[PDB]
Swiss-Prot record:
EC category name: oxidoreductase
Family: Belongs to the MsrA Met sulfoxide reductase family.
Active site, UniProt feature: 15
Record gene name: msrA
Protein's name according to its UniProt entry: Peptide methionine sulfoxide reductase MsrA
């Protein structure tokens, strides 16, 4: 409806509790929710989500932050070099993915991955999936805002200050 309408991203990078808890406090992030996306079956749940990834849908204000900045933070908080695993969480549920809503997001995602790789600062090849966004199945209430409600809960996400691009 206008040039600076809020924009949306869906990112997957492991256990969704940790990904949400870090992203939610980023500048320009208006709202977040966790869920299941990128897979096959409809009406996905924690117990039954097939090939879906645990993911975070992010609504953001493009005059306060931008898609590139959010992706740079994403690559700073999860290890994007492990296939179908994040830390000790193993399986396709935990894979690294960027689900793009438009061609610009696709291009920015690929450009960001190229810069990450060229930096040599990350531990290996980036294995992040870049795929068009589809259905996003909102997770159950108990998984929403989990580390806000239970701050000593499990997480293996954290900021790596050295996983940073000085320039693009």
């Amino acid at each position: 409806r206008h040039m600076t309408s809020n924009q949306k991203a869906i990112l997957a990078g492991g256990c969704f509790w940790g990904l949400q808890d870090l992203i939610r406090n980023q500048p320009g992030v208006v709202s977040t929710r966790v869920g299941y996306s990128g897979g096959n079956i409809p009406n996905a749940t924690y117990r039954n989500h097939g090939t879906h990834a645990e993911a975070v849908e992010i609504i953001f204000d493009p005059t306060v932050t931008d898609y590139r900045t959010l992706l740079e933070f994403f690559f700073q908080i999860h290890d994007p070099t492990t296939k179908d695993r994040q830390g000790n969480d193993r399986g396709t549920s935990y894979r690294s993915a960027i689900f793009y809503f438009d061609e610009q997001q696709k291009r920015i995602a690929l450009d960001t991955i190229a810069d990450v790789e060229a930096s040599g600062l990350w531990p290996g090849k980036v294995v992040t999936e870049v795929s068009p966004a589809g259905d996003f199945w909102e997770a159950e209430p108990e998984h929403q805002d989990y580390l806000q409600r239970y701050p000593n809960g499990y997480t293996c996400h954290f900021v790596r200050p050295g996983w940073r691009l000085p320039r693009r």
